[PDB]
Amino acid sequence: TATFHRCAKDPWRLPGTYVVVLKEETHLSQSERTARRLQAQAARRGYLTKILHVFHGLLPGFLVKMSGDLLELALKLPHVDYIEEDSSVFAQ
Amino acid sequence: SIPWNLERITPPRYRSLVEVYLLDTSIQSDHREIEGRVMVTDFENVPEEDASKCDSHGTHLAGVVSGRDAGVAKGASMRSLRVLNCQGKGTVSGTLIGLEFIRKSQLVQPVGPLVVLLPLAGGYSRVLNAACQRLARAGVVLVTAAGNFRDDACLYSPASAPEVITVGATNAQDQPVTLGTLGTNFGRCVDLFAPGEDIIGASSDCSTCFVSQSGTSQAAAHVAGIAAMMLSAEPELTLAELRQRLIHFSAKDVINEAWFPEDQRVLTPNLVAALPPSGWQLFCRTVWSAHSGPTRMATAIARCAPDEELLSCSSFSRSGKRRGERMEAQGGKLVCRAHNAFGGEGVYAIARCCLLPQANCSVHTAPPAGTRVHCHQQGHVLTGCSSHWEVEDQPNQCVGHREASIHASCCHAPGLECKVKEHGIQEQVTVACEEGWTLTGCSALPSHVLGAYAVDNTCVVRSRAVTAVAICCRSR
Amino acid sequence: XXFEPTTFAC
Ligand SMILES: [Ca+2]
Numbered sequence: 001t002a003t004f005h006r007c008a009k010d011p012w013r014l015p016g017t018y019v020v021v022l023k024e025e026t027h028l029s030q031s032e033r034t035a036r037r038l039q040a041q042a043a044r045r046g047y048l049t050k051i052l053h054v055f056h057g058l059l060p061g062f063l064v065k066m067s068g069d070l071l072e073l074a075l076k077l078p079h080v081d082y083i084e085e086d087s088s089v090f091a092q
Numbered sequence: 093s094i095p096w097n098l099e100r101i102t103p104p105r106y107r108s109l110v111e112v113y114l115l116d117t118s119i120q121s122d123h124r125e126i127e128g129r130v131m132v133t134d135f136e137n138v139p140e141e142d143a144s145k146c147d148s149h150g151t152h153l154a155g156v157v158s159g160r161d162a163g164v165a166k167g168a169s170m171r172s173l174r175v176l177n178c179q180g181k182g183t184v185s186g187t188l189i190g191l192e193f194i195r196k197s198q199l200v201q202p203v204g205p206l207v208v209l210l211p212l213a214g215g216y217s218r219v220l221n222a223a224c225q226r227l228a229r230a231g232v233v234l235v236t237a238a239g240n241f242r243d244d245a246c247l248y249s250p251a252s253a254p255e256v257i258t259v260g261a262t263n264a265q266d267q268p269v270t271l272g273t274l275g276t277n278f279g280r281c282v283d284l285f286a287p288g289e290d291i292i293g294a295s296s297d298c299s300t301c302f303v304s305q306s307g308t309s310q311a312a313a314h315v316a317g318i319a320a321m322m323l324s325a326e327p328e329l330t331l332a333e334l335r336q337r338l339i340h341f342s343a344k345d346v347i348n349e350a351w352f353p354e355d356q357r358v359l360t361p362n363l364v365a366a367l368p369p370s371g372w373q374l375f376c377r378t379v380w381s382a383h384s385g386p387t388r389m390a391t392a393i394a395r396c397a398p399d400e401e402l403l404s405c406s407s408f409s410r411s412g413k414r415r416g417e418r419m420e421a422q423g424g425k426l427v428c429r430a431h432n433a434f435g436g437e438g439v440y441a442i443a444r445c446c447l448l449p450q451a452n453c454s455v456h457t458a459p460p461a462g463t464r465v466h467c468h469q470q471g472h473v474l475t476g477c478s479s480h481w482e483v484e485d486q487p488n489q490c491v492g493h494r495e496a497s498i499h500a501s502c503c504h505a506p507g508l509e510c511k512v513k514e515h516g517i518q519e520q521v522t523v524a525c526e527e528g529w530t531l532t533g534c535s536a537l538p539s540h541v542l543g544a545y546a547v548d549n550t551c552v553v554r555s556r557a558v559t560a561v562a563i564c565c566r567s568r
Numbered sequence: 569x570x571f572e573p574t575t576f577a578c
Contacts, residue, residue, distance in 0.1 A: 005218050005219075007214065007215045007216075007217065008215055008216065009214075009215040012214055012215055014139075014183060017183075017185060019184070019185055019188065019219050021219055021222070052185075053185075053189055055188070055189075055192060057192050057195045057196055057199075058188075058191065058192055058195055058223050058226040058227055058230070059188075059192075059219070059222060059223055059226060063185050063188075063189075082218065082219075084184070084217065084218055084219045086183050086184055086185045087183070087184050087214055087215065087217065088139075088181060088182070088183060088184075088214050089175075089176075089181070089182040089183065089184060089187055089212045089213060089214040089220075090176075090180060090181055090182070090212060090213060090214065091116070091117065091149045091176050091180030091181075091211065091212060091307075091309070092211055092212055092213050092237035092239060092240050092307050092308050092309040092312075
């Protein structure tokens with residue numbers, strides 16, 4: 001049910017940072033919990049993570065800096081709607 | 093003395109409670125043009141690099157929006173967020189955080205109507221589109237650049253976000269900017285065009301300097317200032333009302349469409365923004381689908397915005413191998429669905445979307461025998477006719493060929509008056525509603541029609557002995 | 569200065 005997306009224009013991709021978007025009704029307390037859950041799981045595999053930001057107000061979810069190897073793990077987390085790899089925007 | 097672009101958008105008759113947010117590079121907030129009217133926010137989120145350069149872009153745009161001498165909405169209060177670094181680069185994620193920042197500032201210190209200018213683009217982003225959609229649902233007006241790649245805007249974000257006003261760039265000759273392989277993006281995700289080449293505005297070089305820049309952002313900044321002024325005059329406008337009015341007040345058919353790729357010409361709205369001239373009127377707009385695939389069962393869908401009503405539905409394919417269209421319910425809304433045929437490269441669905449409150453609407457179908465249906469009452473009006481078929485090769489009443497099923501759009505709106513206007517003669521036949529009237533439905537009477545679509549208030553039918561049928565309404 | 573390289577990707 002949880003899908004993953006990265007920018008179709010390869011040179012504009014920014015691998016290593018991921019926006020995890022939780023299902024719509026998700027309360028901020030669950031968002032943060034889920035972020036901590038993912039951190040725990042990744043640590044049990046010797047991966048280092050950093051939760052850059054937790055989103056609430058428009059979308060629930062969080063910004064995570066982490067190896068892409070953890071994407072499959074991240075996608076199984078409760079509440080996850082989809083995950084999108086960060087990517088560039090430019091002055092127009 | 094008047095910059096071409098400020099003149100281009102002034103309507104034939106003319107003479108601070110609104111805030112415009114700007115997500116951009118740094119701002120020289122004390123440049124003469126904007127001094128005192130731009131508040132630098134305390135928000136910053138930029139990727140690392142890899143002093144005049146750093147604030148050039150944002151400074152010029154704030155200038156276009158609100159500048160004392162060369163600005164569109166000269167009395168405009170603005171707020172800047174820094175999301176582009178000195179090379180003008182940002183991240184999707186940094187932008188999200190900024191947009192989130194706006195909603196938070198709104199919740200903690202509300203003011204009046206908010207306009208958000210987003211002078212940036214990356215490729216289609218799901219999350220960035222979603223964020224924009226929520227910020228729009230929350231009652232905020234977003235204006236964005238169509239993008240500078242002489243390409244389809246639907247492939248870029250936030251340009252592709254449907255709820256945001258997406259703005260392409262035209263030049264002093266009113267033509268779509270082109271430059272080599274670059275230039276204004278185009279296509280169905282573009283809502284309208286505005287002046288975007290050779291635009292005078294504040295230069296970060298010194299407190300009193302001006303410079304000419306060009307870009308779809310400049311085009312977008314014009315629309316944001318026009319929007320700021322529209323909302324000063326009528327602050328209760330919703331986004332949907334605001335979008336319809338921008339389209340309505342734009343100059344029509346001044347763009348030579350041969351500048352666009354062949355298959356984007358019908359999709360790209362022929363509109364160059366303008367301030368409105370300065371009780372209730374019927375506003376409508378035409379919404380195009382993406383081209384469906386070439387498979388038989390391929391279909392295309394066009395949808396209206398949440399507060400709009402779908403008043404009619406048509407379809408088109410330039411080969412003409414299509415099986416027509418039909419209005420069907422989907423998620424509580426009428427949606428317009430078009431059908432491809434065997435050997436067909438695919439088809440477009442084309443919706444007419446209007447602002448008509450006080451109204452309930454339904455579709456009435458009759459199956460094949462030609463075939464007829466009608467709206468069976470009074471003060472309940474027929475606004476559109478659709479027709480589809482399974483094969484391959486009258487007031488208030490729709491009629492189509494005997495091997496075809498037929499559909500009527502019926503609306504309850506006793507404030508509305510409608511009339512049906514026909515004309516026939518041959519590549520193309522058109523008929524237009526009289527001034528003061530709004531085109532709600534466009535179709536062809538049953539030779540060989542490639543299709544039909546509404547262009548502003550003109551019904552167009554394309555053929556290869558053919559008559560176009562327009563339904564036209566107004567308030568009484 | 570027309571299309572300043574300050575705009576991407578002019
Ligand atoms: Ca749009």
